[PDB]
Coordinates of C-alpha atoms and ligand atoms in Angstrom, one line a residue:
Chain A
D1 CA 4.2 17.5 -2.9
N2 CA 7.4 18.2 -1.0
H3 CA 6.2 16.2 2.1
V4 CA 6.4 18.8 4.8
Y5 CA 3.2 18.7 6.9
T6 CA 1.9 21.1 9.6
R7 CA 0.3 18.6 12.0
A8 CA 1.2 14.9 11.2
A9 CA 3.0 12.5 8.9
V10 CA 3.3 8.9 8.0
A11 CA 6.2 7.6 6.0
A12 CA 5.6 4.0 4.6
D13 CA 7.0 2.1 1.6
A14 CA 3.8 2.2 -0.3
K15 CA 1.8 5.4 -1.0
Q16 CA -1.6 3.9 -0.4
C17 CA -0.4 2.7 3.1
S18 CA 0.9 6.1 4.1
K19 CA -2.5 7.4 3.1
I20 CA -4.3 4.8 5.2
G21 CA -2.2 5.7 8.2
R22 CA -2.8 9.4 7.6
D23 CA -6.6 8.9 7.4
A24 CA -6.5 7.0 10.6
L25 CA -4.7 10.0 12.2
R26 CA -7.3 12.3 10.6
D27 CA -10.1 10.3 12.2
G28 CA -8.7 10.8 15.7
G29 CA -6.3 7.7 15.9
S30 CA -3.1 7.9 17.9
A31 CA 0.3 7.3 16.3
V32 CA -0.2 3.6 17.2
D33 CA -3.7 3.3 15.5
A34 CA -2.1 4.8 12.4
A35 CA 1.0 2.6 12.6
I36 CA -1.2 -0.5 12.9
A37 CA -3.6 0.6 10.1
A38 CA -0.6 1.3 7.8
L39 CA 1.1 -2.0 8.7
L40 CA -1.9 -4.0 7.9
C41 CA -1.8 -2.4 4.4
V42 CA 1.9 -2.9 4.0
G43 CA 1.3 -6.6 4.7
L44 CA -0.8 -6.5 1.5
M45 CA 1.1 -4.2 -0.9
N46 CA 4.5 -5.4 0.2
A47 CA 3.4 -9.0 0.9
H48 CA 7.0 -10.1 0.1
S49 CA 8.3 -8.1 3.0
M50 CA 6.1 -8.4 6.0
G51 CA 2.6 -9.3 7.3
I52 CA 0.6 -11.2 9.8
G53 CA 2.8 -14.4 9.2
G54 CA 5.8 -12.6 10.6
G55 CA 6.9 -10.5 13.6
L56 CA 7.7 -6.9 14.6
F57 CA 9.2 -4.4 16.9
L58 CA 7.6 -1.0 17.7
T59 CA 9.5 1.9 19.3
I60 CA 6.9 4.2 20.7
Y61 CA 7.3 7.7 22.1
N62 CA 4.5 9.2 24.2
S63 CA 4.6 13.1 24.1
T64 CA 2.3 13.4 27.2
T65 CA 4.4 11.2 29.5
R66 CA 7.6 11.9 27.6
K67 CA 8.5 8.2 27.9
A68 CA 9.6 5.9 25.2
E69 CA 8.9 2.2 25.1
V70 CA 9.5 -0.8 22.9
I71 CA 7.1 -3.6 22.0
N72 CA 8.9 -6.8 21.2
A73 CA 6.6 -8.9 19.0
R74 CA 9.3 -10.9 17.1
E75 CA 8.8 -14.5 16.2
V76 CA 10.1 -17.2 18.6
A77 CA 11.4 -20.7 18.0
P78 CA 8.6 -23.3 18.4
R79 CA 8.7 -25.4 21.6
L80 CA 9.9 -28.4 19.6
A81 CA 12.8 -26.6 17.9
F82 CA 16.5 -27.5 18.8
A83 CA 20.0 -26.3 18.0
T84 CA 20.8 -29.0 15.4
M85 CA 17.5 -29.0 13.6
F86 CA 18.9 -27.8 10.2
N87 CA 21.8 -29.2 8.2
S88 CA 21.5 -26.9 5.1
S89 CA 20.6 -23.3 4.4
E90 CA 17.9 -24.8 2.1
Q91 CA 16.3 -26.4 5.1
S92 CA 16.3 -23.2 7.2
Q93 CA 14.9 -21.1 4.4
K94 CA 12.2 -23.0 2.7
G95 CA 9.2 -25.0 4.0
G96 CA 7.2 -25.3 7.3
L97 CA 10.3 -26.2 9.3
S98 CA 11.7 -22.7 8.6
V99 CA 8.7 -21.0 10.2
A100 CA 8.9 -19.4 13.6
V101 CA 5.9 -18.6 15.7
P102 CA 4.4 -15.3 14.3
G103 CA 4.1 -12.4 16.8
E104 CA 2.7 -9.7 14.6
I105 CA -1.0 -9.7 15.7
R106 CA -0.1 -10.0 19.4
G107 CA 2.2 -7.1 18.9
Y108 CA -0.5 -5.0 17.3
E109 CA -2.9 -6.0 20.1
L110 CA -0.5 -4.9 22.9
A111 CA 0.3 -1.7 21.2
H112 CA -3.4 -1.0 20.6
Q113 CA -4.3 -1.9 24.2
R114 CA -1.8 0.7 25.5
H115 CA -2.2 3.5 23.0
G116 CA -5.2 2.9 20.7
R117 CA -7.9 5.5 20.2
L118 CA -9.8 4.0 17.3
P119 CA -11.8 0.7 17.4
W120 CA -9.8 -2.4 16.6
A121 CA -12.1 -3.2 13.6
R122 CA -11.5 0.3 12.2
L123 CA -7.8 -0.4 11.7
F124 CA -8.5 -3.3 9.4
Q125 CA -11.4 -1.8 7.4
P126 CA -9.4 -0.1 4.5
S127 CA -7.1 -3.1 4.1
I128 CA -10.0 -5.5 3.9
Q129 CA -11.3 -3.3 1.0
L130 CA -8.0 -3.0 -0.7
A131 CA -7.4 -6.7 -0.6
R132 CA -10.8 -7.5 -2.2
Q133 CA -10.7 -4.6 -4.8
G134 CA -7.1 -5.2 -5.7
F135 CA -4.2 -2.8 -6.4
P136 CA -1.5 -2.3 -9.0
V137 CA 1.8 -4.1 -8.1
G138 CA 4.3 -1.4 -7.0
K139 CA 8.0 -1.1 -7.8
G140 CA 9.2 -3.0 -4.7
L141 CA 6.9 -6.0 -5.0
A142 CA 7.4 -6.2 -8.8
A143 CA 11.2 -6.6 -8.3
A144 CA 10.7 -9.1 -5.5
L145 CA 8.3 -11.1 -7.8
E146 CA 10.9 -11.1 -10.6
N147 CA 13.8 -12.0 -8.2
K148 CA 11.7 -15.1 -7.1
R149 CA 9.9 -15.8 -10.4
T150 CA 11.1 -19.4 -10.6
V151 CA 10.1 -20.5 -7.1
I152 CA 6.8 -18.6 -7.3
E153 CA 5.7 -19.9 -10.8
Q154 CA 6.3 -23.5 -9.7
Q155 CA 4.4 -23.2 -6.4
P156 CA 0.7 -23.4 -7.3
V157 CA -0.5 -22.0 -3.9
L158 CA 1.7 -18.9 -4.4
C159 CA 0.9 -18.6 -8.2
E160 CA -2.8 -18.5 -7.2
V161 CA -2.4 -14.8 -6.1
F162 CA 1.0 -13.8 -7.5
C163 CA 0.7 -14.8 -11.1
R164 CA -1.4 -13.8 -14.1
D165 CA -1.7 -16.6 -16.7
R166 CA 1.0 -18.6 -14.9
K167 CA 3.7 -15.8 -14.9
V168 CA 4.5 -13.6 -12.0
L169 CA 2.6 -10.3 -11.9
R170 CA 4.6 -7.3 -13.3
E171 CA 4.6 -3.7 -12.1
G172 CA 1.3 -2.0 -12.7
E173 CA -0.7 -5.3 -12.9
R174 CA -3.6 -5.9 -10.4
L175 CA -3.0 -8.1 -7.4
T176 CA -6.0 -9.3 -5.3
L177 CA -5.7 -11.1 -2.0
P178 CA -9.2 -12.5 -1.3
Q179 CA -8.3 -15.1 1.3
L180 CA -6.3 -12.6 3.4
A181 CA -9.2 -10.2 3.1
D182 CA -11.4 -12.8 4.9
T183 CA -8.7 -13.5 7.4
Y184 CA -8.3 -9.8 8.1
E185 CA -12.1 -9.6 8.5
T186 CA -12.1 -12.4 11.0
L187 CA -9.3 -10.6 12.9
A188 CA -11.3 -7.3 12.9
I189 CA -14.4 -8.8 14.4
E190 CA -13.1 -11.7 16.6
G191 CA -9.9 -9.9 17.6
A192 CA -6.3 -11.0 18.2
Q193 CA -7.5 -14.2 19.9
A194 CA -8.8 -15.6 16.6
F195 CA -5.2 -16.1 15.4
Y196 CA -3.6 -17.4 18.7
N197 CA -6.5 -19.3 20.3
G198 CA -9.6 -19.0 18.2
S199 CA -11.1 -19.7 14.8
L200 CA -7.9 -19.4 12.8
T201 CA -5.6 -21.4 15.1
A202 CA -6.2 -25.0 13.9
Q203 CA -5.8 -24.0 10.2
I204 CA -2.5 -22.1 10.9
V205 CA -1.1 -25.2 12.6
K206 CA -2.3 -27.5 9.8
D207 CA -0.8 -25.3 7.1
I208 CA 2.6 -25.1 8.8
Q209 CA 2.7 -28.8 9.7
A210 CA 1.6 -29.9 6.2
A211 CA 4.6 -28.1 4.8
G212 CA 6.9 -30.1 7.2
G213 CA 6.7 -27.6 10.1
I214 CA 6.5 -28.3 13.9
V215 CA 4.5 -25.3 15.2
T216 CA 1.6 -26.5 17.3
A217 CA -1.5 -25.0 18.8
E218 CA 0.3 -24.7 22.1
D219 CA 3.0 -22.5 20.5
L220 CA 0.3 -20.1 19.3
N221 CA -1.6 -20.2 22.6
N222 CA 1.6 -19.4 24.5
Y223 CA 3.0 -16.6 22.3
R224 CA 3.2 -13.2 24.2
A225 CA 4.2 -9.8 22.9
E226 CA 6.4 -8.1 25.4
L227 CA 6.5 -4.5 26.8
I228 CA 9.9 -3.1 27.3
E229 CA 9.6 0.0 29.4
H230 CA 13.2 1.0 29.2
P231 CA 14.6 0.7 25.7
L232 CA 18.2 1.3 24.8
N233 CA 19.2 5.0 24.6
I234 CA 22.2 7.0 23.8
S235 CA 22.9 10.7 24.1
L236 CA 23.6 12.6 20.9
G237 CA 24.3 16.3 21.6
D238 CA 21.1 17.6 23.0
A239 CA 19.0 14.6 22.0
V240 CA 18.4 11.1 23.2
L241 CA 18.0 8.2 20.8
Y242 CA 15.7 5.4 21.7
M243 CA 16.2 2.0 19.9
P244 CA 15.7 -1.7 20.8
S245 CA 18.3 -3.7 22.6
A246 CA 19.2 -7.4 21.8
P247 CA 17.8 -9.4 20.1
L248 CA 17.7 -6.4 17.8
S249 CA 20.6 -4.3 16.6
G250 CA 20.3 -1.1 18.8
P251 CA 23.6 -2.0 20.5
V252 CA 25.4 -2.1 17.1
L253 CA 23.8 1.2 16.1
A254 CA 24.7 2.8 19.4
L255 CA 28.3 1.6 19.1
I256 CA 28.6 3.0 15.5
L257 CA 27.3 6.4 16.5
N258 CA 29.3 6.6 19.8
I259 CA 32.5 5.9 17.8
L260 CA 31.7 8.5 15.2
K261 CA 30.5 11.3 17.6
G262 CA 34.1 11.7 18.8
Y263 CA 35.0 13.0 15.3
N264 CA 32.5 15.9 15.5
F265 CA 31.3 15.5 11.9
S266 CA 29.5 18.6 10.5
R267 CA 28.9 20.1 7.0
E268 CA 32.6 20.7 6.7
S269 CA 33.3 16.9 6.9
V270 CA 31.9 16.5 3.4
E271 CA 32.9 19.9 1.8
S272 CA 36.1 18.8 0.0
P273 CA 37.1 15.4 -1.3
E274 CA 40.0 15.3 1.1
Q275 CA 37.6 15.7 4.1
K276 CA 34.8 13.6 2.5
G277 CA 37.1 10.6 1.8
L278 CA 38.5 10.6 5.3
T279 CA 35.0 11.0 6.8
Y280 CA 33.6 8.0 4.8
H281 CA 36.7 5.9 5.6
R282 CA 36.1 6.6 9.3
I283 CA 32.5 5.6 9.0
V284 CA 33.4 2.3 7.4
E285 CA 36.0 1.6 10.1
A286 CA 33.3 2.3 12.7
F287 CA 31.0 -0.2 10.9
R288 CA 33.8 -2.7 11.2
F289 CA 34.5 -2.2 14.9
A290 CA 30.8 -2.3 15.6
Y291 CA 30.2 -5.5 13.7
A292 CA 33.1 -7.2 15.5
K293 CA 31.2 -7.1 18.7
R294 CA 27.8 -8.0 17.2
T295 CA 28.8 -11.7 17.1
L296 CA 28.3 -12.0 20.9
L297 CA 24.7 -10.8 20.8
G298 CA 21.6 -13.1 21.1
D299 CA 18.2 -13.2 22.8
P300 CA 19.0 -11.9 26.3
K301 CA 16.5 -14.3 28.0
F302 CA 18.7 -17.2 26.9
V303 CA 22.2 -15.7 26.7
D304 CA 23.9 -13.3 29.1
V305 CA 24.6 -10.1 27.1
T306 CA 24.3 -7.4 29.8
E307 CA 28.1 -6.9 29.8
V308 CA 28.6 -6.9 26.0
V309 CA 25.6 -4.5 25.7
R310 CA 27.1 -2.3 28.4
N311 CA 30.3 -2.1 26.4
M312 CA 28.5 -1.4 23.2
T313 CA 26.6 1.6 24.7
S314 CA 29.6 3.0 26.6
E315 CA 31.2 6.1 25.2
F316 CA 34.5 5.3 26.8
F317 CA 34.5 1.9 25.1
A318 CA 33.7 3.7 21.9
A319 CA 36.5 6.1 22.4
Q320 CA 38.9 3.1 22.9
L321 CA 37.8 1.8 19.5
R322 CA 37.9 5.2 17.8
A323 CA 41.6 5.5 18.8
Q324 CA 42.4 2.3 17.0
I325 CA 40.9 3.7 13.7
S326 CA 43.8 4.6 11.4
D327 CA 43.2 7.6 9.1
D328 CA 45.4 6.2 6.3
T329 CA 44.4 2.5 6.2
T330 CA 41.9 -0.2 6.8
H331 CA 43.0 -3.3 8.7
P332 CA 42.8 -7.1 8.6
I333 CA 39.8 -8.8 10.2
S334 CA 41.7 -9.9 13.4
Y335 CA 42.5 -6.2 14.1
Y336 CA 38.9 -5.6 15.2
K337 CA 38.8 -8.5 17.6
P338 CA 35.6 -10.2 16.4
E339 CA 34.6 -12.7 19.2
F340 CA 32.7 -16.0 18.8
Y341 CA 32.7 -17.1 22.5
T342 CA 33.0 -16.0 26.2
Chain B
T1 CA 11.3 -6.4 6.1
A2 CA 9.5 -3.1 5.9
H3 CA 10.0 0.0 8.0
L4 CA 7.4 2.5 8.9
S5 CA 7.7 5.9 10.6
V6 CA 4.8 7.9 12.1
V7 CA 4.4 11.2 14.0
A8 CA 0.9 12.2 15.3
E9 CA -0.5 15.7 15.8
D10 CA 0.0 15.5 19.6
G11 CA 3.7 14.8 18.9
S12 CA 3.7 11.1 19.8
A13 CA 5.6 8.9 17.4
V14 CA 6.0 5.3 16.3
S15 CA 9.0 3.7 14.6
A16 CA 8.0 0.2 13.4
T17 CA 10.0 -2.4 11.6
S18 CA 8.3 -5.7 10.6
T19 CA 9.4 -8.8 8.8
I20 CA 8.8 -12.3 7.4
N21 CA 12.5 -12.5 6.7
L22 CA 13.3 -13.5 3.1
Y23 CA 11.3 -12.4 0.1
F24 CA 7.9 -14.3 0.6
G25 CA 9.3 -15.8 3.9
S26 CA 9.2 -19.6 4.0
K27 CA 7.3 -19.7 0.6
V28 CA 4.4 -21.3 2.6
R29 CA 1.1 -19.6 1.8
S30 CA -2.0 -21.0 3.4
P31 CA -4.6 -21.8 0.7
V32 CA -7.4 -21.2 3.2
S33 CA -6.3 -18.1 5.1
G34 CA -3.9 -16.5 2.7
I35 CA -1.3 -16.0 5.4
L36 CA 2.3 -16.1 4.1
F37 CA 4.5 -17.6 6.8
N38 CA 7.9 -16.2 7.9
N39 CA 11.2 -18.1 7.6
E40 CA 12.6 -16.3 10.7
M41 CA 14.3 -19.6 11.8
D42 CA 16.9 -18.7 9.2
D43 CA 18.1 -15.8 11.3
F44 CA 19.5 -18.2 13.9
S45 CA 23.1 -19.4 13.6
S46 CA 23.5 -23.2 13.0
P47 CA 26.6 -25.3 14.0
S48 CA 26.2 -27.3 10.7
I49 CA 25.7 -24.5 8.2
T50 CA 28.6 -22.4 7.0
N51 CA 27.3 -19.1 5.5
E52 CA 30.6 -17.4 4.6
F53 CA 34.0 -18.7 3.9
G54 CA 36.0 -18.7 7.1
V55 CA 33.1 -17.5 9.3
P56 CA 32.3 -19.7 12.3
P57 CA 28.7 -20.0 13.7
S58 CA 27.7 -17.7 16.6
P59 CA 26.8 -19.8 19.7
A60 CA 25.0 -16.9 21.3
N61 CA 22.5 -17.0 18.4
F62 CA 21.8 -20.8 18.3
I63 CA 18.3 -22.2 18.3
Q64 CA 16.6 -22.9 21.6
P65 CA 12.8 -23.6 22.0
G66 CA 11.2 -20.2 22.9
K67 CA 14.3 -18.2 21.9
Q68 CA 14.2 -15.2 19.5
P69 CA 16.8 -15.0 16.7
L70 CA 19.2 -12.1 16.3
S71 CA 17.9 -9.3 14.1
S72 CA 19.5 -6.4 12.2
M73 CA 16.4 -4.3 12.7
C74 CA 16.6 -1.1 14.7
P75 CA 13.5 1.2 14.6
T76 CA 14.6 4.4 16.2
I77 CA 13.2 7.6 17.7
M78 CA 15.3 10.6 18.4
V79 CA 13.8 13.0 21.0
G80 CA 15.1 16.6 21.7
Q81 CA 16.0 17.8 25.2
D82 CA 12.6 19.7 25.3
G83 CA 10.8 16.3 25.0
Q84 CA 9.8 16.9 21.3
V85 CA 10.5 14.3 18.7
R86 CA 13.3 15.2 16.3
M87 CA 13.6 12.1 14.1
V88 CA 11.7 8.9 13.4
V89 CA 13.8 6.5 11.4
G90 CA 14.5 2.9 10.5
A91 CA 15.3 0.7 7.6
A92 CA 14.7 -2.6 5.8
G93 CA 17.4 -4.8 4.2
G94 CA 19.4 -7.5 6.0
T95 CA 22.6 -6.6 7.8
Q96 CA 22.5 -3.3 5.9
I97 CA 19.6 -2.1 8.1
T98 CA 21.9 -0.9 11.0
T99 CA 24.5 0.8 8.8
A100 CA 21.8 2.4 6.6
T101 CA 20.0 3.7 9.7
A102 CA 23.3 5.0 11.0
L103 CA 23.9 6.7 7.6
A104 CA 20.5 8.4 7.5
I105 CA 21.1 9.8 11.1
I106 CA 24.6 10.9 10.2
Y107 CA 23.4 12.5 7.0
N108 CA 20.7 14.5 8.7
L109 CA 22.0 15.2 12.1
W110 CA 25.7 15.9 11.3
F111 CA 26.1 16.6 7.5
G112 CA 22.9 18.7 7.6
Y113 CA 21.1 17.1 4.7
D114 CA 17.3 17.5 4.6
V115 CA 15.3 14.3 5.3
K116 CA 14.6 13.6 1.6
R117 CA 18.3 14.0 0.7
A118 CA 19.3 11.9 3.8
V119 CA 17.1 9.1 2.5
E120 CA 18.1 9.4 -1.2
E121 CA 21.9 9.9 -0.6
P122 CA 24.1 7.0 -1.7
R123 CA 25.0 4.5 0.9
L124 CA 27.8 2.0 1.6
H125 CA 28.1 -1.0 3.9
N126 CA 30.8 -3.1 5.6
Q127 CA 30.1 -5.8 8.1
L128 CA 33.6 -7.0 8.8
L129 CA 32.8 -10.5 7.5
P130 CA 32.8 -10.7 4.6
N131 CA 35.8 -8.4 4.2
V132 CA 34.5 -6.0 1.6
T133 CA 33.0 -2.5 1.4
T134 CA 29.9 -2.4 -0.7
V135 CA 29.0 0.9 -2.3
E136 CA 25.9 2.0 -4.1
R137 CA 26.1 2.7 -7.9
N138 CA 25.8 6.5 -7.7
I139 CA 28.2 7.1 -4.8
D140 CA 30.6 10.0 -5.1
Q141 CA 33.6 8.4 -6.8
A142 CA 36.0 10.5 -4.8
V143 CA 34.7 8.5 -1.8
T144 CA 35.4 5.2 -3.7
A145 CA 38.9 6.5 -4.5
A146 CA 39.5 7.6 -0.8
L147 CA 38.5 4.1 0.3
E148 CA 40.6 2.2 -2.3
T149 CA 43.8 4.2 -1.6
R150 CA 43.2 3.2 2.0
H151 CA 43.2 -0.5 1.0
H152 CA 39.5 -1.1 1.2
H153 CA 38.3 -3.5 -1.5
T154 CA 35.1 -2.0 -2.8
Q155 CA 32.4 -3.5 -5.0
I156 CA 29.3 -2.1 -6.4
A157 CA 25.9 -3.2 -5.1
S158 CA 24.0 -4.8 -8.0
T159 CA 20.7 -3.4 -6.8
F160 CA 20.8 -1.0 -3.8
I161 CA 21.6 -0.8 -0.1
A162 CA 18.6 -0.9 2.3
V163 CA 15.3 0.9 2.4
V164 CA 14.9 3.9 4.8
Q165 CA 11.6 5.7 5.8
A166 CA 12.1 8.8 7.9
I167 CA 10.4 11.8 9.5
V168 CA 12.2 14.9 10.8
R169 CA 10.9 17.9 12.7
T170 CA 11.6 21.2 10.9
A171 CA 10.6 24.9 11.2
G172 CA 7.8 24.1 8.7
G173 CA 6.5 21.1 10.6
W174 CA 7.3 17.5 9.9
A175 CA 9.4 16.6 6.9
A176 CA 8.8 13.1 5.7
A177 CA 10.6 10.8 3.3
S178 CA 10.1 7.4 1.8
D179 CA 12.9 5.6 -0.1
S180 CA 12.7 5.8 -3.9
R181 CA 14.6 2.6 -4.0
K182 CA 11.4 0.8 -3.0
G183 CA 8.8 3.4 -4.4
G184 CA 7.1 4.4 -1.2
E185 CA 5.6 7.9 -0.8
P186 CA 4.7 9.7 2.5
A187 CA 1.4 11.2 3.5
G188 CA 0.2 13.7 6.1
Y189 CA -1.7 16.9 6.8
Ligands
GSH401 N1 15.1 -11.1 9.2 C1 16.2 -10.2 9.0 C2 15.9 -9.1 7.9 C3 15.5 -9.8 6.6 C4 15.5 -8.8 5.4 O1 15.6 -7.6 5.6 N2 15.3 -9.4 4.2 C5 15.4 -8.6 2.9 C6 15.0 -9.5 1.8 S1 16.2 -10.8 1.5 C7 14.8 -7.3 2.7 O2 13.7 -6.9 3.3 N3 15.6 -6.4 2.0 C8 15.3 -5.0 1.7 C9 14.3 -4.9 0.5 O3 14.7 -5.2 -0.6 O4 13.1 -4.5 0.7 C10 16.4 -9.4 10.4 O5 15.5 -9.4 11.2 O6 17.5 -8.9 10.6
NAG402 C1 -8.4 -23.2 18.9 C2 -7.5 -23.2 20.1 O1 -6.3 -23.2 20.0 N1 -8.1 -23.4 21.3 C3 -7.4 -23.4 22.6 C4 -7.8 -24.6 23.5 O2 -7.6 -25.8 22.8 C5 -7.0 -24.5 24.8 O3 -7.5 -25.5 25.7 C6 -7.1 -23.2 25.5 C7 -6.3 -23.0 26.8 O4 -6.2 -21.6 27.1 O5 -6.8 -22.1 24.6 C8 -7.5 -22.1 23.4
NAG403 C1 20.0 -32.6 10.7 O1 20.8 -33.5 11.4 C2 20.5 -33.7 12.8 C3 21.6 -34.5 13.4 O2 21.7 -35.7 12.7 C4 19.0 -34.3 12.9 O3 18.6 -34.4 14.2 C5 18.0 -33.4 12.1 O4 16.8 -34.0 12.1 C6 18.5 -33.1 10.7 N1 17.6 -32.0 10.1 C7 17.1 -32.0 8.9 C8 16.2 -30.9 8.6 O5 17.3 -32.9 8.1
NAG404 C1 0.4 8.4 26.6 O1 0.1 8.1 28.0 C2 -1.2 8.2 28.3 C3 -1.4 8.3 29.9 O2 -0.5 7.5 30.5 C4 -1.9 7.0 27.7 O3 -3.3 6.9 28.2 C5 -1.9 7.1 26.2 O4 -2.2 5.9 25.6 C6 -0.5 7.6 25.6 N1 -0.8 8.5 24.5 C7 -0.4 8.2 23.2 C8 -0.7 9.1 22.2 O5 0.3 7.1 23.0
NAG405 C1 18.9 5.5 29.4 O1 18.8 4.2 29.9 C2 19.3 4.1 31.2 C3 18.6 2.9 31.9 O2 17.2 3.0 31.8 C4 19.1 5.3 32.1 O3 20.4 5.9 32.3 C5 18.2 6.4 31.6 O4 16.9 6.3 32.4 C6 17.9 6.4 30.1 N1 17.8 7.7 29.6 C7 16.7 8.3 29.2 C8 16.8 9.7 28.7 O5 15.6 7.8 29.3
NAG406 C1 34.1 -4.8 28.0 O1 35.2 -3.9 27.8 C2 36.4 -4.0 28.5 C3 37.4 -2.9 28.0 O2 36.8 -1.6 27.9 C4 37.0 -5.4 28.4 O3 38.1 -5.5 29.3 C5 35.9 -6.4 28.7 O4 36.5 -7.7 28.4 C6 34.7 -6.2 27.9 N1 33.7 -7.2 28.3 C7 33.2 -8.1 27.5 C8 32.3 -9.1 28.0 O5 33.6 -8.1 26.3
NAG407 C1 40.6 -7.9 4.5 O1 40.6 -6.7 3.7 C2 41.6 -5.8 3.9 C3 41.5 -4.9 2.6 O2 40.3 -5.0 2.0 C4 43.0 -6.4 3.9 O3 43.9 -5.6 4.7 C5 43.1 -7.8 4.5 O4 44.2 -8.5 4.1 C6 41.8 -8.7 4.1 N1 41.9 -10.0 4.7 C7 41.8 -10.3 6.0 C8 41.9 -11.7 6.4 O5 41.6 -9.5 6.9
CL408 CL1 -5.1 -14.0 -0.4
CL409 CL1 10.8 -0.7 3.9
NA410 NA1 9.9 13.3 0.7

């Protein structure tokens, strides 16, 4: 194919999951039903990347209302977490202590409640099948599996599904995920509540704590996905761009693009090496200015960022930064005024 | 992290980025449920841990009970003045997510590359600290030259920079692209 479609499209990082999203659309699902169905699949085929143990953000545009919204379903620190809980990168990267409270399923549930057209169980059906039947390991997972071969091969509970004859699966080899298949089935029939306050909850807590974690039933009971009715936007010519604000990187993206829009890039900007080189230099300098301000961002419910974010989405502020970009040189770090306090 | 982009027949759209953080997250798999648990606690700044030489921790992103860690994710939907979706785009890949999402938008919207080219086009990344411009292997080497004569210190990404999924409205309908760097493929009707 060339991947131009008349009516609808799903772009995922595994073919089988794009197809599962497409079939859901074909069966009368909204864009959300499709997204959820495809995401459930990606949690299987790209198990290294994402899944129901993690968290997500959805940016959603409704063509009827012409309104855009964001669903924040990112993990949160457990109630017993504290600033000085880790003393090495090792401690914050491996084991139960490194685990934040998963928001994935609550996020799916809120998105489905607001925009779903298919039954909840229907979104899980093809992934339940896929996880039992198995699938060839794709390019992405294969390379992840190789990158982490040591840690995986020496952890029996991971080797159980990710090894063949005690060696990580290679590209093309069959991966089955039978336990997840059952878990997905429970979720399909009992609903979101099975994870957060239901039949899966005690076992989740037990697994996390047995690995040294501090997530408790209360953490799960209290998790809430959040509807953000007014996401970040910027104006770009005749278009508006909707993206999430802090704690995500919409503000950084907005700043990068507002800086660069003052240069009026076009086809001509990459036509000759003289133009092309200047264009890419300007792009990198915009990255640098945008990342300088990034260090003041954090969860806006805990840190006051309204001013910082206002600056990062302001065109005038962007113009001020653009004017400090030198066409003939990059600069030392201090030149961009990174800030670590206010 | 994984990004997904969706446009339905009625013209509604979803841009979705989801993550367990590092490859296989915390490395804690439940033997009973099969759930792989995230290590998203690692996205917080810590006063004890020094990540990069000369880089102080960010107090705005310290751990508090109930707090969400800073993320590089930025799932994005661009909508035309007429209320029709023009672009659904996002990326996976650490701090490279934001710059790669910027690049794909720049490539399509301003340079005029079709969605597939916009996704496949070589990328580069700089995040101020560390103090280095990372370029993909097959970048136009005139770009490399233009950066180095301008005193950038460049280095070549040993693998690749980010993973972008995107959909763009065209005359023909919806053009879709999945990043060959990870091996995805789109689908539609
Ligand atoms: N948790 C981070 C993102 C973590 C992330 O993207 N990790 C890597 C793996 S270390 C990844 O997905 N890289 C792109 C890929 O190789 O798929 C955030 O929210 O900003
Ligand atoms: C399995 C599980 O977590 N059950 C909990 C229960 O203990 C708690 O009293 C209730 C309060 O809403 O929520 C649910
Ligand atoms: C790190 O040190 C602090 C302060 O001494 C302590 O409270 C905390 O338990 C330690 N964390 C780990 C994971 O060892
Ligand atoms: C758009 O809004 C309508 C009416 O407010 C709502 O019922 C529906 O869920 C939304 N449609 C889509 C496709 O998301
Ligand atoms: C952009 O966000 C601000 C605050 O909500 C406001 O100016 C406006 O409503 C938004 N623009 C669009 C097109 O939604
Ligand atoms: C926002 O930008 C203005 C200059 O445009 C600056 O004076 C002010 O300090 C900035 N505010 C913050 C919180 O950085
Ligand atoms: C950072 O990099 C640029 C060139 O790569 C250079 O001007 C500068 O000396 C470097 N160091 C600092 C501390 O900014
Ligand atoms: Cl499993
Ligand atoms: Cl991805
Ligand atoms: Na394509």
